[PDB]
Nucleic acid binder design. Structure first.
Ligand SMILES: [Mg+2]
Ligand SMILES: [Mg+2]
Lengths: 119, 44, 56, 112
RNA sequence: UUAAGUUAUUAAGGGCGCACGGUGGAUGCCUUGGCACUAGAAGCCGAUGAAGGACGUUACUAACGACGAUAUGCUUUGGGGA
RNA sequence: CCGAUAGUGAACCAGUACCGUGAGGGAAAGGUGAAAAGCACCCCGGAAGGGGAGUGAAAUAGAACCUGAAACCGUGUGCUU
RNA sequence: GUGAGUCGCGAAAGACGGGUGAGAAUCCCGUCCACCGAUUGACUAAGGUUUCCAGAGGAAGGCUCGUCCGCUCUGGGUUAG
RNA sequence: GUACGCGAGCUGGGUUCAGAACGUCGUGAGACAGUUCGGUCCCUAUCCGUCGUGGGCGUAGGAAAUUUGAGAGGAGCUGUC
RNA sequence: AAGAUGAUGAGGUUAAUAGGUUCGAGGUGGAAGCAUGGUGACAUGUGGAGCUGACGAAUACUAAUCGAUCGAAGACUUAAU
């Protein structure tokens, strides 16, 4: 367990970060939030290997109701993408891809920043 | 609170205005001092 | 609440034997030929933590 | 030989700069560039500019090389003091001091 | 190698001295303004519109002076000599 | 008699800025050099600022510009802890 | 100067990406998220007096940074039988 | 006993502020030998002291472990059957 | 496992340090869908089902990379071999 913020706002912040990282496959953040969203998104790639309806009814909670995506002028929803695409790369592997890179600090707040990716 | 000096024009271009002063003896004297002393403004 | 006395030029300095700051970790790059800080990224050229895995 | 360079009226206090200097005094140039260029503070950009500027003037004007160049002495001194004032309770004031500085670096090689 | 005895080296930092700067502006020197006075003149202005002021006027124009829609000045009479 | 904390409050764009509803009260602020000859040009720098080169007898006189003290702050160092 | 690099930084939910730029937690763009909703909405009076809009700039102001502003510079805007 | 301990640790009920009232004394304003309803308690800890805890140096070479214990602190009560 | 910070301790690829995965404990207490019985609200089966933060083993898939700093060569005097 770990605290960035209050209860609610933390949670929604994590549905947000984890909603991203798949839209973009990597982001730049402070280290702490990357650790927590790592745990989450690890659990979601563990989910999207199974692929049952119920699995969608568990990825529904955390991930958002929609966030549109276009690669080839295509319509996706960050859910179709997950169970349809992502896990189909890392089936032969366990969950637990995500890696972290202690990039550098930040002039404003002195906070360490990183580049967490699933690529 | 509502502090003193809730401002307004009419009560300030009245009382402290000119035509009051230059319609009263004492006020004429007042102006005499604010002239003798030199000032860039009167009735204020 | 308050001081009663003037803090002299000595104690004001002895008190400041600890506002120094530490020599940060450093090492040359493995194939970017320059210095950076440990268990971190280079910020240059192509990123070199074990070699390039990034652009920025 | 000798060499130097200056920055004036820089909008930082002496002390905050002076620490950063105490991470410098004695070193070789390359290192000190690195040391400044990494630490996440507000003075590091400035001192970095002034240092490398000094190496610039040394190179062009005096025709030195870069290996043996070392930081003989460095120090920041007090500057003009833009007095301001922040209001404060009970009908009063308090005069802030927006301070300044005059940074001094003297690169040297040590030889002739 | 043994026991006993003694004793300095350290300066993270500080004090005494010596130097070099920075800060801020006293002193020194000077006057662009004033204080107090002597001799002499003058001691009022205004409904034929004052004193004092507003708004404007310049090739470009914010302010002081100067001037007032004939407006950053007009004519005359003298003086003066680029 | 004063020679910029004096002397008019006012040597400078002052009965101003400013304060107050208003009567009214009331500031701080002089000096480059002989002459603006007020730093062409190169270099770092985003700039500012600076090092150089030059004007000048002198630019540690370079515009916050005569002289530049003390407080205060530093850098190094002989002795010492 | 000391106090002190100490108290404070003036109720509050933001995050990510892409640009810019010398340089970005704070600037623009979007997607998501959260908040008020007899209102943090819309319209006028009193009041203030050019704060309004465009284009540039960032010395100081902004309680941080600032490539931005209600700050500066230039220019421009208010129409009645 | 220790400012009838301790308010830069707390309260603030009476009492020592302003109001009002009862008995009273006073010609009167007002005052008690008294009584009664109510009534604003600020201090961001410099030094010493104290509770805990890290640096530097020393213990005639440098290190890791174990441990002696001159001294100091603590415990110290008591019923019934 | 200790923690305000610093310290203490477990650990750093020649590895199980933390995360994740797979098992497990414990906890909650019969997931969803499906069918069946119901006019429906709802029940039964599929099923001690599904879920699961901190606890327990295993599992190098990811993260502790490559690295730099500091630290001795043992003074004299006696008395001993
Ligand atoms: Mg003087
Ligand atoms: Mg961004």
């Amino acid at each position: 367990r770990k605290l960035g913020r209050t209860s609610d706002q933390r949670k929604a912040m994590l549905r947000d970060l984890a909603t991203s990282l798949i839209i973009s496959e990597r982001i730049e953040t402070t280290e702490a939030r990357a650790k927590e969203v790592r745990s989450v998104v690890e659990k979601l790639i563990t989910l999207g290997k199974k692929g049952d309806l119920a699995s969608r009814r568990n990825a529904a909670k955390t991930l958002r109701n929609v966030e549109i995506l276009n690669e080839d002028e295509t319509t996706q929803t960050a859910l179709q993408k997950l169970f349809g695409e992502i896990a189909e790369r890392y089936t032969e592997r366990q969950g637990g891809y995500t890696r972290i890179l202690k990039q550098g600090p930040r002039r404003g707040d002195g906070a360490e920043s990183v580049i967490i990716e699933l690529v | 609170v509502k502090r003193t000096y809730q401002p307004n024009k009419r009560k300030h271009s009245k009382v402290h205005g000119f035509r009051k002063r230059m319609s009263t003896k004492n006020g004429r004297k007042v102006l005499a001092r604010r002239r003798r002393k030199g000032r860039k403004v009167l009735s204020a | 609440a308050v001081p009663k006395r003037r803090t002299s030029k000595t104690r004001k300095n002895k008190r400041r034997t600890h506002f120094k700051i530490s020599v940060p970790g450093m090492t040359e790059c493995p194939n970017c030929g320059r210095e950076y800080k440990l268990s971190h990224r280079v910020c240059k050229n192509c990123g070199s933590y074990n070699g390039e895995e990034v652009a920025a | 030989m000798e060499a130097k360079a200056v920055a004036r009226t820089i909008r930082i206090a002496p002390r905050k700069v002076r620490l950063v200097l105490d991470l410098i005094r004695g070193k070789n140039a390359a290192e000190a560039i690195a040391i400044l260029k990494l630490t996440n503070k507000a003075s590091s950009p400035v001192i970095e500019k002034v240092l490398m500027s000094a190496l610039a003037n040394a190179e062009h004007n005096y025709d030195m090389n870069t290996d043996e160049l070392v930081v003989k002495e460095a120090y920041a001194n007090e500057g003009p003091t833009l007095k301001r004032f922040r209001p404060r309770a009970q009908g009063r004031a308090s005069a802030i001091n927006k301070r300044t500085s005059h940074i001094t670096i003297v690169v040297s090689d040590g030889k002739e």
